Amino acid sequence: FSRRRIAYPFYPFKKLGRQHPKKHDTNLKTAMRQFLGPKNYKGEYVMNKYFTVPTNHVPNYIKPDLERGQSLEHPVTKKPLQLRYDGTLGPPPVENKRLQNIFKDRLLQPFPSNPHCKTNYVLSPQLKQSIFEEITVEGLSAQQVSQKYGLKIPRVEAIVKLVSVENSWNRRNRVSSDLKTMDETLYRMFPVFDSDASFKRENLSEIPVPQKTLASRFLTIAESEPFGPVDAAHVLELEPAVETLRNLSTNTKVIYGELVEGERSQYKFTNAKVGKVGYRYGSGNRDNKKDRRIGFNKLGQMVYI
Amino acid sequence: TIPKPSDQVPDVDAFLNKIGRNCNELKDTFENNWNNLFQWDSKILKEKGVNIQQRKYILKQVHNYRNNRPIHEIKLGKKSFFGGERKRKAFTAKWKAEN
Amino acid sequence: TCGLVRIRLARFGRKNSPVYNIVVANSRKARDAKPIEVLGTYVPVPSPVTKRELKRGVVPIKDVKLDFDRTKYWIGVGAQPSETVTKLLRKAGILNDAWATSKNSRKVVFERMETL
Amino acid sequence: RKACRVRLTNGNVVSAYIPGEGHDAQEHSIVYVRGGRCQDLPGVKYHVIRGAGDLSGVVNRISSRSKYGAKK
Amino acid sequence: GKGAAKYGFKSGVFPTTRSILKSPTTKQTDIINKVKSPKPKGVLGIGYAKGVKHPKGSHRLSPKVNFIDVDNLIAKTVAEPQSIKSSNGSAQKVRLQKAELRRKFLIEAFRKEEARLLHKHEYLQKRTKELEKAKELELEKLNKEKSSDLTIMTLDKM
Amino acid sequence: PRKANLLKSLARGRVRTSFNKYNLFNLYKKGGVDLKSKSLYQQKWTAKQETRAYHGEHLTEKRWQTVFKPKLDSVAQLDIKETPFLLQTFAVLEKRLDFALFRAMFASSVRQARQFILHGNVRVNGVKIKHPSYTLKPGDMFSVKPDKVLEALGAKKPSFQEALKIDKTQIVLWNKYVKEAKTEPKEVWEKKLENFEKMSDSNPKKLQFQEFDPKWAKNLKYHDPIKLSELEGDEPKARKLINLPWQKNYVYGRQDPKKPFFTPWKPRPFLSPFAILPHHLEISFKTCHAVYLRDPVARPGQSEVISPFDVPVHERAYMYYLRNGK
RNA sequence: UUAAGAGUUAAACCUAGCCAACGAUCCAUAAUCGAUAAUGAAAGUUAGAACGAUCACGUUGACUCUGAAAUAUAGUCAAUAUCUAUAAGAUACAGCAGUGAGGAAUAUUGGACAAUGAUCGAAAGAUUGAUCCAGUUACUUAUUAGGAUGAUAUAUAUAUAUAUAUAAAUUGAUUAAAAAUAAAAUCCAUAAAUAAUUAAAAUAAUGAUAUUAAUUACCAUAUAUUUAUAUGGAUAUAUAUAUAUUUUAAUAGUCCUGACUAAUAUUUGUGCCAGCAGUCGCGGUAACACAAAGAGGGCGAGCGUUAAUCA
RNA sequence: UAAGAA
Ligand SMILES: [Mg+2]
Ligand SMILES: [Mg+2]
Ligand SMILES: [Mg+2]
Ligand SMILES: [Mg+2]
Ligand SMILES: [Mg+2]
Ligand SMILES: [Mg+2]
Ligand SMILES: [Mg+2]
Ligand SMILES: [Mg+2]
Ligand SMILES: [Mg+2]
Ligand SMILES: [Mg+2]
Ligand SMILES: [Mg+2]
Ligand SMILES: [Mg+2]
Ligand SMILES: [Mg+2]
Ligand SMILES: [Mg+2]
Ligand SMILES: [Mg+2]
Ligand SMILES: [Mg+2]
Ligand SMILES: [Mg+2]
Ligand SMILES: [Mg+2]
Ligand SMILES: [Mg+2]
Ligand SMILES: [Mg+2]
Ligand SMILES: [Mg+2]
Ligand SMILES: [Mg+2]
Ligand SMILES: [Mg+2]
Ligand SMILES: [Mg+2]
């Protein structure tokens, strides 16, 4: 069974009563107004909890279920408010007990309906500079930096590149005041990555799950045989799962052509083998088909492969 | 570079008259300048109002003159007097009967 | 060109986007018919070079893939290259200046260099 | 129910239902016949296309105009 | 296009690669010994038996395989000018350069093909005798008595 | 692509990839997707409806069905909570440049990210890319023009008329405060200190205050009332005619009226509910650069595909798109 | 006879065989296939348009010459049908355009040989309806086809929950009944245009496409490695030089909402009529199904429908 | 990598 269901709020709100013939209003609009609170002469909603950004590295994600859909607060004292019968905003008659003891995992959960979405941890500029110095100056391998700071290796390399770009931009005075204010207000919104904590440091033993293993296979053997990861790897015809981590932690003859004055291009001839080189004859044409191959040029132009 | 006018081809008018292919009517679009004949490219000629075949022929003959090759008029091939091969038998049948 | 066996270019790709197979073909078969052998590929469009890289001084690259040992075999048994293929093979070092023509005949800024 | 016998260009003579509120089909009219039976008329296994040939589209049609040969 | 799965998912075809040497050569002792071996009889026999007479106009034996002598093939296909030289003219020089290049390429191709065939035979013999050892090592390593085999019930006497 | 139409309808209540205020309320009032009392088709349809409203709404149904992958990618940890495999139903959209920009928070929406790409403001490891469908591979660095990012993340720049009216109101309130302070400084000091006591130290003003005299009220100066009718159309005039302790020599929100955002840059309103740091990108906000580390994966207890819907909704949507809605 | 086997074709002699219910002979129908297309979990099934491979034919039939190879789009004879030149004549568009017909239905009487080939030539070059481009056509597939903000308009009066009043307020409705952040307005863009250049397809030279793509929003140069500040040619101004340095948007249909099957905000007309319908079925005064308004659900430069294929 | 419905 299914009907159209206007997405009314799941929490109580005061609905319209008798309306002046010319109001022309909807209950959804009133629900939004109550959620937002009064709008300033400046076009601002100071009374709404979520109007302003946090500043203490504790994200201010929505909690419509814990707080019963009461999103209003005093902007200066931050104390909860409620809409009284007379159309004013005052203290709640009773205090909420679900808004003080909030599980620390819930504070990093952007969406109330998805427990598996959590925000990442921002790295402090000091840690990023430390990693950049370690990788570039002291020449420490990315594996041991990853282990020391508990960061996945691609993230470490990305940090190195991003810090290099930042260094260039700072040497050129391209980081304007607006950019610095934006960066620092964004940085104070998210939790800060802590190298020392065990539960805040990234797991460093992850490997992709290939299709080959995903199928469950079972072996019946004598009751006392040992059967370890290496035997399992042999059975599935794969490298053992430890060499996968080990390998993830880490000729053709060519002839360049004679250029002469006035010639606008050079020829390089790469050696190939007959029966493997060429455009095949009677190959599948997909240009009129839904999976036609689209690629991008070295200049970023969309081309048809 | 711009080559030297020769005694065989003193003026641009002489060049046009020698290459032929009814480019004699194209003497006006040039200002009779050796530099104009030997510096104008295909796009300039297209702007000036030269048709495709004429400008391609002129560029070919200008190149020949640059590399010291004769610029005598090559004539575009024509059909036989008795029509083309596919219509030759019919034409000759009608021609011999009528004469 | 002459002879029954000829090394020439067979057109592939879309309209306004030519690519070519370097092929050994019977002289009578169609240009895009299945040949005796596909010796390689040829992309006539040079690889784009950035303007800063033009300041550096790189030359745009025209890409040619080729089976050199088999191409020399086909030249040996008498196959006749076309004009464009003749140009391609002369600049690859397979053919020497004896295959040049009067029109095609100059200071060398770079020298044909073989790498591994 | 409004129907008509129609002789097709392939020579077969069929019975075709005429959909829509009102029709202007008459003897010797040129029509176009598609598949689709009229369920409550036995023997009529084809439909005439409104808005094609000499059969005009339904007059003052608002909804489903394309099914009845009506312009916007 | 699921047939392409049978060919590495490659759509379209190439012309089949021509063989530079169209018959086995003389420097290939394996094929020579194989053809020159006794011919079997019985259920897998190849030819006519001792007392059986073949059809009147037919040949009892398959045609004689004619092995290639690459030295002779080069000698006849591309022989160098027996005259010392002429060395005049311009087109004559162009033709001389072209002819020597063509000849050089053709000897190179023929001899490299010879070498590749013989090298392939050597490699295949080594591969066979390396597999024949790896397989035996594996079968024997599945013969080392495992202690856990004491838990598999046995009735060897019966 | 689809023409944006009623993307923020409160009655429909679909959640979009956007920092919009109406989108924020739609997300807030939602609750969960109600799957009870529904046939399997109705469940799958509801799931598809909601999840496609969020993930890649601007893609046509047929294009999305073409780019949909039954393959779901996950990582096994070799050193327990259940891996939410089917939150990867829409992971393939995350390698698109327009989604990468939105996850990097370089655009207020995927739609705005598309426009930023199409107008030439985006680069992928050096080369300008003008095609939103462009797909990033691991390790690719992309960047956005900093003004575009600052405008996406910043507050709207007011027009002259609106800012001038706001500043008129500023003058009136400042003068009212000055009068109240001058007449009765006792009660004003009392209220000021009481409010300082009430407020939390989170405000910077409290920290600065931690860091009676009748002379105080003598420093407060009235501000002349402005009438905009005569002042209309002349920005250099109104700029010098406004002088307040907080905003000095500029009309409200237009400190430098040649940049594309609220010029004394402050974050856009309602930014914190959507401020989510992705796990598959590294973001440098000073340079407005980012690196695409990997395709999002699911691990025990977590999925890196950011979504406002629970595992059952994505399961039902995945069932829908496996069979083309059969 | 043939280069060559064979009742292959011709001649002679013999023997009485050969095929066939695991389907002969006969009849009908059909070009065949793929590393091609569709579909499906797959086995498979379908197509054989496109790309490629093979065969056959060039109005119909037989024969002959030449040739390595031809019953050749050749020649001879005949048939059919047209033209005149009225002859032991020519032509046969299944080459490219194009016309008429048939049909539900399938386009230019286009440009260039610039590229890749092919023919002739010693070469210079000539020819090429191959080919390459363009035209027509939503036939198919892509990409774009605008983002952010946005529920009022007037008045009066180093702080900040601004507060008072007067106007108005479209359709539906009297609250979980909405249309609707939708409009309008606001901010910021880009496309197009406008100018400057301008590669690449091709080089020894040649560019049909072509009012090319791409780039720059005055032009260069001179250093840094795209963002910069400088030196010099522009630039009207006011009075060489402080200044600025093109303009600039927004355009969706079509089907459906009783169940199968997504569509709850309800109303009006008709009254077993008119009609609807893929299946069950709906319509007899209270129609969620007919015809419509409001609202709503799909897909979207398409949507529906018919014909078909696969599942 | 095999779903059914009236
Ligand atoms: Mg329903
Ligand atoms: Mg002549
Ligand atoms: Mg020749
Ligand atoms: Mg209808
Ligand atoms: Mg015989
Ligand atoms: Mg006989
Ligand atoms: Mg039979
Ligand atoms: Mg037939
Ligand atoms: Mg068939
Ligand atoms: Mg075909
Ligand atoms: Mg065809
Ligand atoms: Mg024939
Ligand atoms: Mg005909
Ligand atoms: Mg015939
Ligand atoms: Mg024709
Ligand atoms: Mg007709
Ligand atoms: Mg040509
Ligand atoms: Mg022509
Ligand atoms: Mg009303
Ligand atoms: Mg009624
Ligand atoms: Mg119905
Ligand atoms: Mg109806
Ligand atoms: Mg309506
Ligand atoms: Mg489309």
Side-chain angles (χ1 to χ4, degrees):
Chain A
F1 174 79
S2 188
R3 58 169 184 95
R4 173 163 185 261
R5 293 180 179 91
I6 284 159
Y8 296 112
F10 70 90
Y11 49 76
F13 71 98
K14 67 182 290 294
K15 304 175 195 178
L16 294 172
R18 265 294 305 174
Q19 288 291 277
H20 168 52
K22 295 183 173 65
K23 272 282 178 284
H24 301 318
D25 201 32
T26 81
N27 295 31
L28 301 160
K29 273 154 184 171
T30 68
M32 199 187 169
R33 279 200 304 278
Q34 298 168 30
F35 160 79
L36 281 177
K39 183 172 71 180
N40 288 358
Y41 64 94
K42 293 193 277 185
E44 295 210 302
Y45 309 93
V46 303
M47 297 288 273
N48 187 276
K49 279 172 69 174
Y50 312 105
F51 184 79
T52 61
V53 293
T55 59
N56 47 43
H57 305 270
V58 185
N60 184 23
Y61 297 142
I62 56 156
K63 299 168 180 62
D65 50 318
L66 301 184
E67 79 201 5
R68 294 152 206 88
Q70 304 295 303
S71 59
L72 307 176
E73 268 189 351
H74 194 277
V76 176
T77 77
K78 299 291 180 68
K79 293 178 74 68
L81 292 173
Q82 184 178 2
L83 190 140
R84 279 88 62 77
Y85 71 98
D86 49 21
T88 65
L89 271 46
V94 184
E95 175 198 342
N96 301 327
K97 300 294 187 291
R98 309 179 62 191
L99 212 69
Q100 290 85 28
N101 294 324
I102 310 182
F103 293 98
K104 67 182 290 294
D105 58 80
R106 181 66 156 87
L107 282 156
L108 304 181
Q109 196 200 275
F111 300 121
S113 289
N114 190 23
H116 311 273
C117 178
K118 274 138 163 185
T119 186
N120 199 6
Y121 292 105
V122 174
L123 312 174
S124 65
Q126 286 72 242
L127 183 65
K128 286 187 290 189
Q129 259 290 338
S130 302
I131 285 158
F132 182 83
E133 290 164 358
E134 280 160 64
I135 293 295
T136 59
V137 169
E138 294 147 41
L140 303 185
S141 72
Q143 294 82 17
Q144 51 197 2
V145 179
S146 170
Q147 293 298 116
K148 179 183 179 182
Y149 289 130
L151 300 166
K152 283 190 276 285
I153 303 174
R155 186 171 188 179
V156 165
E157 292 149 350
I159 291 154
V160 171
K161 287 178 74 70
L162 284 176
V163 169
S164 172
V165 172
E166 283 178 353
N167 285 342
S168 294
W169 276 48
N170 278 303
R171 291 189 296 272
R172 290 185 141 109
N173 189 240
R174 265 169 85 190
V175 192
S176 68
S177 303
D178 304 326
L179 280 172
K180 282 192 282 290
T181 58
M182 185 249 282
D183 172 29
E184 70 89 20
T185 187
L186 265 293
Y187 169 78
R188 294 178 65 88
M189 278 176 94
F190 299 112
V192 178
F193 178 78
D194 186 74
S195 191
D196 302 272
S198 50
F199 64 92
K200 279 175 63 165
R201 61 180 277 132
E202 281 168 10
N203 196 265
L204 304 188
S205 75
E206 286 169 349
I207 61 160
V209 180
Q211 63 84 30
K212 182 64 70 177
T213 68
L214 284 167
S216 60
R217 180 176 325 153
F218 306 85
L219 274 178
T220 305
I221 53 175
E223 57 178 349
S224 73
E225 293 180 354
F227 200 85
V230 177
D231 311 304
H234 289 148
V235 162
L236 300 161
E237 293 83 4
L238 302 158
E239 66 183 1
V242 299
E243 292 82 3
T244 306
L245 270 172
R246 186 178 62 78
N247 301 332
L248 267 70
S249 66
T250 72
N251 200 351
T252 180
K253 181 266 289 181
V254 183
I255 295 175
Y256 277 92
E258 186 181 2
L259 197 73
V260 296
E261 65 183 1
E263 273 190 356
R264 307 151 296 142
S265 302
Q266 185 167 356
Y267 288 112
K268 77 185 284 292
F269 304 82
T270 315
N271 191 15
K273 182 174 73 175
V274 66
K276 298 293 183 182
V277 72
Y279 305 107
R280 286 161 170 275
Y281 288 81
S283 71
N285 183 4
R286 318 296 315 176
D287 288 15
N288 63 324
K289 296 285 138 60
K290 180 165 74 71
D291 54 21
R292 76 175 306 165
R293 284 173 282 263
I294 293 153
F296 293 93
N297 189 358
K298 187 186 278 298
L299 308 171
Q301 306 188 291
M302 200 192 258
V303 298
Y304 288 135
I305 311 185
Chain B
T1 57
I2 298 92
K4 296 294 207 223
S6 188
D7 189 358
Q8 291 78 321
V9 192
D11 190 31
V12 165
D13 291 331
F15 173 89
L16 295 172
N17 206 300
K18 185 171 177 180
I19 60 160
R21 290 204 182 165
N22 200 259
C23 83
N24 309 293
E25 182 65 26
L26 197 81
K27 283 159 175 171
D28 189 358
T29 188
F30 299 96
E31 309 309 309
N32 201 231
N33 290 318
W34 209 249
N35 288 333
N36 285 355
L37 175 62
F38 283 83
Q39 292 202 266
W40 291 359
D41 63 358
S42 188
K43 182 175 73 175
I44 288 160
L45 294 163
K46 176 166 182 175
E47 199 185 80
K48 295 289 184 289
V50 193
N51 69 69
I52 294 150
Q53 296 83 36
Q54 267 184 330
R55 63 201 184 215
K56 286 191 303 193
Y57 184 55
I58 285 152
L59 293 156
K60 187 196 298 181
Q61 294 282 48
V62 168
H63 185 74
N64 289 313
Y65 182 76
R66 287 182 185 275
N67 290 138
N68 307 280
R69 310 199 207 79
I71 77 158
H72 66 84
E73 184 209 56
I74 301 299
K75 288 177 282 186
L76 296 173
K78 58 167 176 64
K79 299 289 185 180
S80 182
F81 168 82
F82 300 105
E85 288 178 302
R86 296 196 175 86
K87 313 173 192 174
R88 186 156 299 154
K89 177 155 67 176
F91 181 97
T92 188
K94 184 156 85 57
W95 177 87
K96 293 182 183 293
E98 287 177 1
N99 307 318
Chain C
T1 310
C2 62
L4 267 46
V5 191
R6 301 180 182 182
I7 306 102
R8 64 195 186 192
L9 297 170
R11 200 198 185 282
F12 276 83
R14 296 164 185 77
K15 291 177 179 178
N16 309 301
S17 301
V19 287
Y20 294 96
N21 281 322
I22 301 151
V23 303
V24 181
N26 289 285
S27 61
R28 295 267 57 76
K29 299 296 290 294
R31 185 194 68 199
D32 299 339
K34 195 168 69 173
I36 297 147
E37 283 193 18
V38 176
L39 283 175
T41 64
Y42 169 44
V43 180
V45 180
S47 303
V49 295
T50 81
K51 301 172 73 179
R52 189 274 307 275
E53 206 164 353
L54 273 183
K55 306 311 183 293
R56 183 177 292 171
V58 71
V59 71
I61 304 300
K62 292 170 74 72
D63 291 331
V64 173
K65 285 191 313 293
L66 194 73
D67 186 340
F68 285 77
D69 275 314
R70 183 58 58 122
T71 307
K72 292 179 181 180
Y73 162 77
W74 282 113
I75 291 288
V77 296
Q80 299 283 347
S82 67
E83 293 83 3
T84 312
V85 167
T86 291
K87 175 195 76 182
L88 264 70
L89 299 174
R90 270 153 38 61
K91 296 193 79 72
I94 295 161
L95 302 181
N96 54 59
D97 291 331
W99 272 265
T101 82
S102 301
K103 292 181 181 180
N104 189 359
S105 292
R106 177 187 315 89
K107 170 59 59 142
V108 301
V109 298
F110 188 79
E111 184 178 1
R112 184 175 66 245
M113 183 278 288
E114 159 166 47
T115 300
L116 183 63
Chain D
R1 302 261 178 244
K2 310 320 196 282
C4 52
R5 297 293 299 274
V6 183
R7 173 153 41 237
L8 306 172
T9 51
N10 56 57
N12 295 293
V13 188
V14 302
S15 315
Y17 186 66
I18 310 171
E21 287 186 331
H23 70 87
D24 56 296
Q26 55 184 13
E27 193 187 287
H28 313 314
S29 286
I30 305 304
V31 294
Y32 288 88
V33 179
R34 59 166 177 79
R37 65 157 182 161
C38 198
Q39 289 78 17
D40 63 359
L41 288 189
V44 182
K45 291 150 278 162
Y46 304 90
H47 274 209
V48 191
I49 294 154
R50 299 302 302 257
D54 291 18
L55 183 57
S56 307
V58 171
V59 187
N60 295 326
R61 187 78 200 187
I62 302 99
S63 66
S64 316
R65 282 185 295 93
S66 68
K67 296 192 175 187
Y68 297 106
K71 299 292 189 294
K72 185 180 285 291
Chain E
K2 55 179 165 289
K6 182 169 189 290
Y7 301 97
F9 295 89
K10 290 182 185 296
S11 185
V13 291
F14 285 126
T16 181
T17 308
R18 307 289 180 100
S19 70
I20 290 161
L21 280 159
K22 282 145 179 69
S23 177
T25 70
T26 57
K27 292 181 183 292
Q28 287 179 231
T29 315
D30 49 288
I31 289 163
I32 293 167
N33 289 346
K34 189 173 183 68
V35 300
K36 301 188 325 187
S37 194
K39 298 170 174 57
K41 299 275 163 273
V43 298
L44 294 174
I46 301 299
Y48 292 91
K50 181 60 66 175
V52 179
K53 51 173 78 172
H54 62 269
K56 181 266 290 181
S58 290
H59 282 278
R60 199 175 184 89
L61 275 295
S62 307
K64 192 62 62 68
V65 185
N66 63 6
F67 295 84
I68 288 163
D69 177 89
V70 167
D71 293 303
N72 189 359
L73 166 69
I74 288 149
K76 291 195 179 299
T77 306
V78 292
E80 58 270 20
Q82 63 84 30
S83 173
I84 304 102
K85 50 160 200 64
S86 177
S87 305
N88 299 344
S90 47
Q92 184 177 2
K93 294 301 191 315
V94 172
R95 288 193 276 109
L96 183 63
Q97 295 168 67
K98 292 197 178 169
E100 84 188 70
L101 200 63
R102 291 176 198 274
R103 170 167 68 252
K104 181 177 72 171
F105 291 173
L106 188 62
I107 296 89
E108 282 185 348
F110 285 164
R111 288 206 152 104
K112 283 188 190 293
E113 187 64 30
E114 184 76 40
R116 190 174 65 72
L117 303 205
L118 275 72
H119 181 77
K120 181 140 52 55
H121 183 254
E122 294 293 328
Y123 168 50
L124 272 175
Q125 295 297 109
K126 292 181 181 179
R127 194 140 156 201
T128 54
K129 293 187 286 185
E130 288 291 332
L131 258 61
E132 275 302 314
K133 299 286 187 219
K135 184 172 184 179
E136 292 295 325
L137 276 296
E138 184 175 358
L139 276 296
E140 290 194 2
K141 182 174 72 68
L142 300 168
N143 197 11
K144 295 165 150 102
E145 309 293 32
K146 299 186 290 188
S147 174
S148 66
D149 305 327
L150 291 165
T151 59
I152 294 158
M153 298 300 104
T154 183
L155 289 171
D156 291 331
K157 179 166 188 182
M158 180 198 51
Chain F
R2 323 206 165 180
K3 184 173 181 64
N5 197 67
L6 300 163
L7 295 180
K8 297 159 283 190
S9 173
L10 300 193
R12 289 168 177 94
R14 312 288 150 66
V15 178
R16 310 290 171 176
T17 61
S18 166
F19 304 160
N20 194 266
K21 174 184 74 178
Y22 291 82
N23 182 50
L24 177 59
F25 181 55
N26 272 331
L27 176 58
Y28 195 82
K29 73 173 155 80
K30 193 69 171 296
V33 186
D34 198 21
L35 291 172
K36 300 289 94 176
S37 71
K38 275 165 181 182
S39 75
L40 188 48
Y41 189 95
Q42 281 149 344
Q43 282 167 62
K44 284 188 287 158
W45 186 270
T46 308
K48 166 248 193 186
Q49 185 183 62
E50 300 292 345
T51 199
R52 283 271 293 136
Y54 190 82
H55 304 261
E57 57 86 22
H58 73 267
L59 290 151
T60 52
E61 189 77 346
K62 298 174 199 296
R63 284 299 318 156
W64 158 244
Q65 184 62 74
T66 301
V67 309
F68 161 78
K69 279 73 176 175
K71 182 65 67 62
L72 310 164
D73 300 295
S74 51
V75 290
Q77 324 196 316
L78 303 194
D79 68 276
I80 297 89
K81 296 183 289 294
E82 293 179 353
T83 310
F85 298 99
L86 282 155
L87 287 175
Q88 306 297 119
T89 296
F90 295 101
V92 57
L93 296 177
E94 294 291 357
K95 59 167 71 66
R96 288 169 58 100
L97 186 62
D98 58 350
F99 273 88
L101 267 71
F102 180 64
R103 295 307 188 197
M105 272 174 273
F106 296 167
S108 175
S109 294
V110 179
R111 289 258 187 202
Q112 191 176 43
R114 291 188 71 256
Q115 299 294 285
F116 286 3
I117 294 153
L118 282 159
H119 296 180
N121 309 126
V122 186
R123 283 172 187 273
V124 175
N125 64 7
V127 64
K128 187 183 292 189
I129 299 288
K130 288 188 184 177
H131 296 120
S133 292
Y134 185 93
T135 49
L136 303 148
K137 65 186 178 78
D140 282 2
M141 173 144 51
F142 59 103
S143 64
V144 179
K145 268 198 163 43
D147 284 9
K148 298 287 98 175
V149 181
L150 291 160
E151 183 178 1
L153 284 180
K156 186 193 163 276
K157 181 160 93 171
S159 50
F160 193 71
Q161 295 298 109
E162 296 164 354
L164 180 52
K165 205 160 304 203
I166 292 171
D167 275 316
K168 180 176 185 289
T169 313
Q170 296 294 141
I171 297 318
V172 174
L173 282 72
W174 174 248
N175 290 354
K176 183 175 284 293
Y177 169 75
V178 166
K179 182 172 182 174
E180 182 65 26
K182 285 209 183 298
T183 56
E184 307 190 357
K186 299 289 94 175
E187 307 194 308
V188 172
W189 211 274
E190 190 66 26
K191 291 174 71 175
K192 177 176 179 182
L193 271 292
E194 182 65 26
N195 287 338
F196 265 103
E197 190 277 331
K198 281 174 154 123
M199 71 167 90
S200 161
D201 52 46
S202 175
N203 297 115
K205 288 184 179 287
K206 184 137 181 161
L207 297 167
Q208 301 158 347
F209 186 80
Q210 293 160 338
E211 183 58 30
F212 178 83
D213 198 71
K215 295 194 192 200
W216 175 65
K218 304 299 188 292
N219 290 318
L220 311 185
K221 312 199 180 177
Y222 279 82
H223 195 299
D224 62 357
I226 59 170
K227 63 188 289 295
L228 57 91
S229 48
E230 67 91 26
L231 189 52
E232 76 195 3
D234 211 299
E235 190 158 9
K237 279 183 181 181
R239 280 174 73 79
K240 65 182 181 180
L241 294 174
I242 301 299
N243 186 3
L244 293 173
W246 47 94
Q247 82 181 251
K248 186 180 289 293
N249 296 115
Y250 63 85
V251 74
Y252 177 58
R254 322 197 60 193
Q255 178 169 10
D256 186 74
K258 299 291 180 68
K259 265 175 257 164
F261 46 82
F262 192 108
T263 315
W265 188 96
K266 62 187 173 88
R268 64 180 298 148
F270 303 113
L271 180 56
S272 69
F274 312 97
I276 309 165
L277 203 71
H279 277 88
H280 69 285
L281 307 170
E282 283 291 326
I283 306 160
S284 166
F285 287 100
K286 289 182 289 186
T287 61
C288 283
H289 278 227
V291 181
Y292 189 82
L293 308 167
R294 61 178 167 286
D295 283 327
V297 296
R299 69 176 57 78
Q302 204 201 323
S303 186
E304 300 177 333
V305 172
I306 293 150
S307 180
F309 306 108
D310 205 7
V311 174
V313 181
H314 290 254
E315 293 168 347
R316 272 148 188 83
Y318 180 80
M319 305 162 60
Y320 180 89
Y321 282 109
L322 274 182
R323 317 219 299 162
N324 295 66
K326 185 167 79 166

